[PDB]
Each structure stands twice: as structure tokens, then as C-alpha cells.
Design a protein around this nucleic acid. Structure first.
Ligand SMILES: [Zn+2]
Lengths: 66, 82, 114, 177, 101
RNA sequence: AGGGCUACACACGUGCUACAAUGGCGCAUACAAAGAGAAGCGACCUCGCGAGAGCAAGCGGACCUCAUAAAGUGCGUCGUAGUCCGGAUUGGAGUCUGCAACUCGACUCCAUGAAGUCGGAAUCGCUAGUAAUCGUGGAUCAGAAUGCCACGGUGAAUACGU
């Protein structure tokens, strides 16, 4: 392909709360810190909560009422 | 705000209806009225049709959609401009 | 002055020229001036560099100009993003805290243009 | 792209059995992916197309090709040769890499993701979908963004039936709700 | 005479006095430090909202006895300013008379 | 059952606050009046900056609670600055009530604290304890007032005249 017009396609890291770290090339540049992936995803599971996927459980145990 | 010593507020019908759903489906909402009930992190992933005075406006429960009231997401007056 | 990346004034009571931090009124000003152990009515130009560094590393226990600014920004950001009513008041740049709206709120709305 | 390797090895291995193909060249291949963004309203502003262009440029590591309206039309008050689109052609490893990127980052990132469709296959195992919002890609800022513009996609394969593209994509564990 | 509003008030007061001393202690369960906020007083709240919100003593407007008026009420006499002024003029209120100083 | 009466391009009307050194803050310090008080006041006590919470005596009251009056006085501080004036707004975190505080409660703490430099044309009130100001209490009231009513506290000018 051409040069100097195509965006930069470095390989960055997709490290999700899923805990999976994948090396994709993209136009991101920085190390990417995620929340959900092809794994730890609802549709890719049947578990409610497919991963902590957000610690608002903390506030929910900050107010404890159950 | 609500007193901590007092806790959260949520209708029992809402909780139990919510429970039967987390028992027995994921695919459809509930048609509620309790704009004053709170959103439990356990209701996440649902898209309940909450009343607003005349209409059951639906609200998809997400992580951040936890610490407010059902009435917070069913506006009541329709302003457009003058 | 250059503490916390800002340039708090000089020839000013220490509690007061401490109020210049975006996040310190007088209360937190006094709080810091005590937690570091410096007199209040000592002007800023009346302060040494040991106490300054003490202040540097004492104010640090708060959120600061850029950090706090950004912080509140992200808070309102979650407001807007979450899709709530307060988010809508904020979106409009209106009273968010429950004021009357048909006449007042020349603070959020701005003066009576139309 | 690992997906490419995975294809070449495991998906290849699977499909030769799955279709009983006697020649690997008879076996389907993903040949290209085209991301078209029918901006359309670029008749209004250039920068939105530019923003869309920046968007389609940022999302995939390949400068875009700005499409133009074929003819002028009154139904959209578009004049002929006017840039009412922007698209990119991903093929090869970039295609595969963006593929892995896609199916493993942005597909979760779907709002109320209920599964991806299994029928928007144009008849020859060439799939076609619609994206409503770009923010699913973390290549987006979501704060320094200008719109929620989507685009449409035509993943043109060498599979020849819609079902074959379906099976092929299933080999990639496509959602297929 | 709007006997609908007055039947609502009487019905509301009747059930608040029926289930009285119940939401009282159901509240006593909740302003006290025990019950772990989740074991007794929490289940207690459930029981609260099972209990008719229409048995609370705050839903009442404290309406005038003769007219059932929402406004201008006065906890001393139980009647509006109007009905009470007419009685005051007529002398049926012992001792009451227009003040002047 | 919910929502509205609380919507908000806007205009107006009342009312509140301020724009400052005759003052702001801090400190200390006294002088009221009146009323209310029992599904209430609630001393104290204890916790909690605090919202308040627990504890809780007494009080149906010339006796117990609101309940310190504030303004003042003196100390210092601020030093005329959008300021140590302001304190809008907004964020967060609370306290409180209620079935419940999103619409649509109040308060508390922290934190930015906006306009705002005394105000067009015009225009209002008032002749003495009045104006002016200080504060107080009460009603309604689950909770809810800058409004209402009432109390005291400082306390002046000019009315030639038509
Ligand atoms: Zn993940």
C-alpha cells in the first residue's frame, strides 16, 4: 500500500477487566485498558455478571442494604 | 439525601418481579410504575418499561445506572422551545 | 506561591492566600495551615521554603486545581453519559440543583437575551 | 492477524470437512472487507465527512477512499460527483487484524448486545451490516468525538452462498443471534 | 359538598387508626441501631410498604369539620376561618372576642 | 397507580441577597419580647464539626424545653480588592422526614464559591420609636416559607408649604 497517508497501525494491548490481554494493531497507540471482551461478555456467556465488569458492587457494599 | 441509616427504597413487587425475571428470562422488560424505587446492581442488563405519569418509558440498567431512582430516568414534562 | 502548580499570592495571610487553590476555601485553607503547622496571618512573603515544601507535600493530600477540575468534569460526564435527568439539566446548562426556571436561573442560562 | 492464522489452519481444516471441499481453492476465503459510510449529509458540511473520514481513518489503519454520489438527486438534493460517502478497503492482514479487533473489542462494546444477525448476507456469502455508532471502537475518544455516526459494512468473501458465509463466520464464532 | 374528598379523608384516617401502632413500631425497628439494617429492619421496610401507604397520618390534609377544606386549616379549632368566624360572631365560642391593643 | 399544578424563548409584579469599611472575618460579651409545648416540648447527658443521632429529665407549663436574643460592646483581623465584599452556580459527601424525598423536600460539610462596582426612563413607602435596622416567636405544617402574623431590640429626617 501507500505511505504517509495511512493511519498508524501499531500493535497495542487490549487488557480488559475480563483479564484477557490481546495484541492487536490499531490506530490507538497507547496500551488499552478495557472492561469487556469477546470473553467476559454476556452474549458470550449466560452468567449474569460475566465478570466483575465494574466494581459498583463496592458502593453496593458501601450501603450494604440487601 | 436519603438517610443512610434508613437505606435504599424499592417496592417489594418490583424486587420480586425482578427476581422472577432473574429466575426466568433475560429477554423482555417489566411494565412498572415505581419511579421512586432504586436500581439494584442486580437489575443490570434489563430494560424495564417504567411509568412516567402516562407512559412506561423504558430504561436499560447498566453498571453506572445503580444509585438513582426510577423516576430519574422517566422525564415528565416535554419542553421543546418557544 | 508555585505550590500545587499554582502561584498563590504573596503579601497575604497564609490562610487567605491558601484559598486561591481551586479546592480550598477558608476551611480547607485553615485545615492545611494547621496540618502543616503554620500561622494564619503570616503573609505568603513571610514564609520560608521549608514550610513551603511542607505545604507542597501537605496540600498533596487533597485533590488540586487540575485534578479536581478534571475530577468534577468526569463526574458531570458520568451524569451526562449515564443518561439521567441531572445529566439533562447539565446538558442544557441549566439549574441542576432544583431552582425555579421560568424567571430565575440567569446564572445557568445567562441573562435575558430573548 | 491471528484470526488469519486460525482461519488458514483451523477454519480451513474445519470447512474442508464441513463442505467436503475437494480443493482448498474450492474452499471459501474472506477476500476483502469494505466499510462504506454513506455520509449523505456531507452536502451540509465538509468537516463531517472529514470527521467521518477521520473516523473511518482512525478506526482502521488505512487511509480512506471518500466516495461520491454517483448522480445528482433531488430526493436527497445531492449533486453528481459529490462526496456523500467515505469508505475503506481492508484486505489482508489489516483486514484480519481489524477483524479480530472488531469481534473481540467492539462487539462486546455494543449497547444491549443481543447477538449479531445471521441473514444480512448479500446472497454470495458476502455479509452486510449496519453500524449505528462508532464509539464501540476504542480507537474513538468518545469525548473528543463529534457524532455517533455509524456506517454500513460489506464483508465481501469468496464464499458463494449466504449460508456459506454464515458457516464461515460461525467458524469465527460469529454471534449469529 | 364533595363527599368524595371527605370519604377519602375519613377512610384514610380510619385505616391509619386501624393499623396505627403498627407502622409506629415498624419505624421503631428502623431508627434503632439493631437489625443490622438488613435482617430485621430491612425486612421491616418490606412490611412497611406492604402496609397501606394509605394508613400513614401524613396523607391527611387536616380538613375542616363542616366543609372538608384543604386550606387555611387551624389545628386548634378544626374548622376553616370562615365557619369559625361565623361561630365567633354568633357567640358559640366561649370567651372569644375581637382583639384590640 | 402515576404525573401536574414546580413545565420555560419571555414580560411583569412582590419579596429575599448583595455589590463593602458606617464595612468582612475572628475572638470575647450582654441586653428582649413573645409564644408554643404531650402522638409536643424536650432539659440535660452521650455520639456526631455538622446535618443530626443515641440518651433522654422535666414541662400541659410565672416552675421543665424551644431559648443564645441579634443588632450591640471591646479585642484583633481584612484594607477597598469582583476583594477575606459576594457566595450565584455547580460537584461531591452527609444529616433529617416520610410509604416515600427523580419530577419534587429541607438541612449539614467540603469544594468552585456567578453575576454583581448601588442600578434607565420611571417609580414606591413613610411624619415617629416612626422610618430605618436587629433579631425573636407563632401559624400552616409528617416535612416543607425569602411569604404571613406577632414580638421585642437599636433608632434617626424632613414636612416650608399646597
Ligand atoms: Zn473482557
Amino acid at each position: 500500500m501507500k505511505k504517509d497517508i495511512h493511519p498508524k497501525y501499531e500493535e497495542i494491548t487490549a487488557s480488559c477487566s475480563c483479564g484477557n490481554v490481546m495484541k492487536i494493531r490499531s490506530t490507538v497507540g497507547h496500551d488499552l485498558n478495557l472492561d469487556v471482551c469477546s470473553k467476559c461478555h454476556p452474549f458470550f456467556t449466560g452468567k449474569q455478571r460475566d465478570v466483575a465488569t465494574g466494581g459498583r458492587v463496592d458502593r453496593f457494599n458501601k450501603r450494604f442494604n440487601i | 439525601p436519603r438517610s443512610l441509616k434508613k437505606g435504599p427504597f424499592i417496592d417489594l413487587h418490583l424486587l420480586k418481579k425482578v427476581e422472577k425475571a432473574v429466575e426466568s428470562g433475560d429477554k423482555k422488560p417489566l411494565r412498572t410504575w415505581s419511579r421512586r424505587s432504586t436500581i439494584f446492581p442486580n437489575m443490570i442488563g434489563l430494560t424495564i418499561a417504567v411509568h412516567n405519569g402516562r407512559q412506561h418509558v423504558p430504561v436499560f440498567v447498566t453498571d453506572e445506572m445503580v444509585g438513582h431512582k426510577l423516576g430519574e430516568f422517566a422525564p415528565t414534562r416535554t419542553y421543546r422551545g418557544h | 506561591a508555585r505550590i500545587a502548580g499554582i502561584n498563590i499570592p504573596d503579601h497575604k495571610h497564609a490562610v487567605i492566600a491558601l484559598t486561591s487553590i481551586y479546592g480550598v476555601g477558608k476551611t480547607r485553607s485553615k485545615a492545611i495551615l494547621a496540618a502543616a503547622g503554620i500561622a494564619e496571618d503570616v503573609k505568603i512573603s513571610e514564609l520560608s521554603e521549608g514550610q513551603i515544601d511542607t505545604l507542597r507535600d501537605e496540600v498533596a493530600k487533597f485533590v488540586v486545581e487540575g485534578d479536581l477540575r478534571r475530577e468534577i468534569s468526569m463526574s458531570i460526564k458520568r451524569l451526562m453519559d449515564l443518561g439521567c435527568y441531572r445529566g439533562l439539566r447539565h446538558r442544557r446548562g441549566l439549574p441542576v440543583r432544583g431552582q425555579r426556571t421560568k424567571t430565575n436561573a440567569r446564572t445557568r442560562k445567562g441573562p435575558r437575551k430573548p | 492477524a491471528k484470526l488469519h492464522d486460525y482461519y488458514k489452519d483451523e477454519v480451513v481444516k474445519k470447512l474442508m470437512t464441513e463442505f467436503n471441499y475437494n480443493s482448498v481453492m474450492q474452499v471459501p476465503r474472506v477476500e476483502k472487507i469494505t466499510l462504506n459510510m454513506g455520509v449523505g449529509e456531507a452536502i451540509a458540511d465538509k468537516k463531517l465527512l472529514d470527521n467521518a473520514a477521520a473516523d473511518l481513518a482512525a478506526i482502521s489503519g488505512q487511509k480512506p477512499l471518500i466516495t461520491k454520489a454517483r448522480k445528482s438527486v433531488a430526493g436527497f438534493k445531492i449533486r453528481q460527483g459529490y462526496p456523500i460517502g467515505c469508505k475503506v478497503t481492508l484486505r489482508g492482514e489489516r483486514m484480519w487484524e481489524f477483524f479480530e479487533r472488531l469481534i473481540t473489542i467492539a462487539v462486546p462494546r455494543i449497547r444491549d448486545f443481543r447477538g449479531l444477525s445471521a441473514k444480512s448476507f448479500d446472497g454470495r456469502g458476502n455479509y452486510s451490516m449496519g453500524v449505528r455508532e462508532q464509539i464501540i471502537f476504542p480507537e474513538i475518544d468518545y469525548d473528543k468525538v463529534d457524532r455517533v455516526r455509524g456506517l454500513d459494512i460489506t464483508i465481501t468473501t469468496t464464499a458463494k452462498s449466504d449460508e456459506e458465509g454464515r458457516a464461515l463466520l460461525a467458524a469465527f464464532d460469529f454471534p449469529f443471534r | 359538598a364533595k363527599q368524595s374528598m371527605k370519604a377519602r379523608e375519613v377512610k384514610r384516617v380510619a385505616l391509619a387508626d386501624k393499623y396505627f401502632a403498627k407502622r409506629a413500631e415498624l419505624k421503631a425497628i428502623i431508627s434503632d441501631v439493631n437489625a443490622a439494617s438488613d435482617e430485621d429492619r430491612w425486612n421491616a421496610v418490606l412490611k412497611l410498604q406492604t402496609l397501606p401507604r394509605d394508613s400513614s397520618p401524613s396523607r391527611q390534609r387536616n380538613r375542616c369539620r363542616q366543609t372538608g377544606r384543604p386550606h387555611g386549616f387551624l389545628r386548634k379549632f378544626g374548622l376553616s376561618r370562615i365557619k369559625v368566624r361565623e361561630a365567633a360572631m354568633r357567640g358559640e365560642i366561649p370567651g372569644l372576642k375581637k382583639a384590640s391593643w
